[PDB]
Amino acid sequence: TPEIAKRPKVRDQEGRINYYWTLLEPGDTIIFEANGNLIAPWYAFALSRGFGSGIIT
């Protein structure tokens, strides 16, 4: 649900967007519904897994 509140201003915004995610298994289905405040997916992506890889800075 939305949590409307005044925030300290960050990057000129007093509001916020939370980001959420899931990994959908092959053959699985996502039923996606909203009554507002939805930022819908685009360029969701298929994952090809492997190993030895990771994230470094």
Next chain:
Amino acid sequence: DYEELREQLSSVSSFERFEIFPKESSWPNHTVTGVSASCSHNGKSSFYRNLLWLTGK
């Protein structure tokens, strides 16, 4: 679960970006708008490439 996502993506060797709901044809009664001022591109107000901020139409 950002930290968890960083971990899930650590083992991804590749991926396929898909249009899931990419066009006005996926969203005939919703549009993409809302605050774009803080996610600008080369000085122009804009939105995230992989997400559709939907508002009513």
Next chain:
Amino acid sequence: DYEELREQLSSVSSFERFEIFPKESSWPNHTVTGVSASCSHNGKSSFYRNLLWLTGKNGLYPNLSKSYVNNKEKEVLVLWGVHHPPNIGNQRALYHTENAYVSVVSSHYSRRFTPEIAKRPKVRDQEGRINYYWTLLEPGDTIIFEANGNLIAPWYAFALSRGFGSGIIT
């Protein structure tokens, strides 16, 4: 997150207790009262030294809105409580509403709380409860603090001076 707080305080070598909202001048339309019977001091009913259990004054609990700007070089630990009455009648009694909520926001987080009124087994003579919550506010950060009832406001929040080798033992 008590266990997490015990860990955060394990590296604190010192701190400065601040009055954040200490007086009737910080709270002209709210007062400090409510159940004090179980937090007595030398036999007298009382309240926590670093927290202000606010109730309405003259029948009202105005939407509360306060903020603190951390204009210090140190991180500030802010503690709050949320009251969870044993009965709906005890919320009304403090002029808190049925739709009371607490909303705490800083540039890096937001959390919203609502009361969960329920009869509890009686503990230390109370059928209700108070949950305690906290955050560490970074230098230059601001907390916007709001409530529609059930708020136990901070007092003697404190600046943390960090170090190492320290911790908590029993």
Next chain:
Amino acid sequence: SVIEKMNTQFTAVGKEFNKLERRMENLNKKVDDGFLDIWTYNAELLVLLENERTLD
């Protein structure tokens, strides 16, 4: 033998933790520091003992 004994590190690269996950961060750190001190100890001790044994 010394070369064969080490397990190529096809392991976690590193992990990030949240503000309220300090105990988890510290557990992970303890695990990394623990394993690091154990392996530094074992690596240096193996080399010192093997060097003394080799020269002997």
